[PDB]
Symmetry: D2
Subunit: 121 residues, 4 copies
Amino acid sequence: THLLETFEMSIDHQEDGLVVISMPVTDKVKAPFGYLHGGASIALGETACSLGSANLIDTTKFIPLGLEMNANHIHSAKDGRVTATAEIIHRGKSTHVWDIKIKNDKEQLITVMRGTVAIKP
Amino acid sequence: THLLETFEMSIDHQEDGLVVISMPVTDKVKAPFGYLHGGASIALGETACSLGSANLIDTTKFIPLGLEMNANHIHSAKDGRVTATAEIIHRGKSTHVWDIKIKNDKEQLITVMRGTVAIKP
Amino acid sequence: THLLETFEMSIDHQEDGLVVISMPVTDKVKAPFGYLHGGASIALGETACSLGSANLIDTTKFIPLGLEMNANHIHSAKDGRVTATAEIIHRGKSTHVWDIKIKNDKEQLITVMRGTVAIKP
Amino acid sequence: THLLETFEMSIDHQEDGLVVISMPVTDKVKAPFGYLHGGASIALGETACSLGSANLIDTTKFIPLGLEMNANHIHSAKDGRVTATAEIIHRGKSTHVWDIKIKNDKEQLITVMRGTVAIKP
């Protein structure tokens, strides 16, 4: 699990075109200020659409590869859990485009993101 | 320190408009396939331009807040260290815009980013 | 109207937090290849959020200013009209964040876009 | 031709990995307010990295296809010409990543951009 383990990520739900993953906001993933580090949030998002694209393709002859990621940071989180919901926007043969919304415990948007995943042999 | 300590980041060089930060590529920050997780590289970059903006303002009066971040993933990193060089593009009164390039051991671009930092009271 | 005139843009529908704007796909807005220029589509989207943020503020005291825009180009538009649907994501005091989806005649996603608008005196 | 023609773009310089293209700031390309419309500036940049990728490939067999564009608007352009300078960041087999900086007359940064171009058969 690597990073996924380091961040204590858990997959709450998966279906085709949809991934919901969450993680605890701990000292380990805070910025020094400290509220959850924007980078930690983004890493959760990239994990979510990587898992999604992997679930949508044939693992045996293909591999999903993050190509482009972008993010707006909105509210902050200092405790509880944050939850990322990745929903697919486009399911191209070569690329997938995902929409990711990351919320805290108060249902506030913490980060809004889009990711582009290349599908490679 | 928090995430900065979790990822074992260290500043190699700072001067007005420039930050160079690096970190070792360990299992703790890999994706499960065995290469540095794209989100960890992005976290490195967000950190670099947050420090850079903090270095340009009166921090008794203002805080830097990451507003928008984007990133292209280019080559991968399996081991060694990765290094983020953040150079400022625009130092405005209310927003700073940063260019960040991240490279592995063999000087390959792993990630290129742009970061928009809000300056808040 | 300017560019909005040059592009023959027109507002299909408007309400709080929502803007639907369309334009004809003409030779004037085409890339030298056969289809609508990606930059023309993005200009439609940026106009859409600018109008929406304007509709959400006191236009006699503050003014909306595009700050950051990002776009995925998914499908092509060869003819007919394209339509941008901008829905607001976060309505902050100093920044508005918008989701924009642009579609052609055949219900295909042409462009998906996120736009950040500064609110300023 | 087409949008290039509409915007009166002039290719000022080309070499491998570099494209300099300018255009006049006319009412045609203004926002209503109105300075140069952000979208017009972005279309100029997307044009520059499209031409640059075309210059790098066998256009008897391949075409450049804009995949992702992002942009920070910085200063505004009121009149004269604006100039887009596109330099390549990464020239991959199937995708190219470009930096584009767009300036006005008074040497001010109007727009900074990163463009991701797909190389398609």
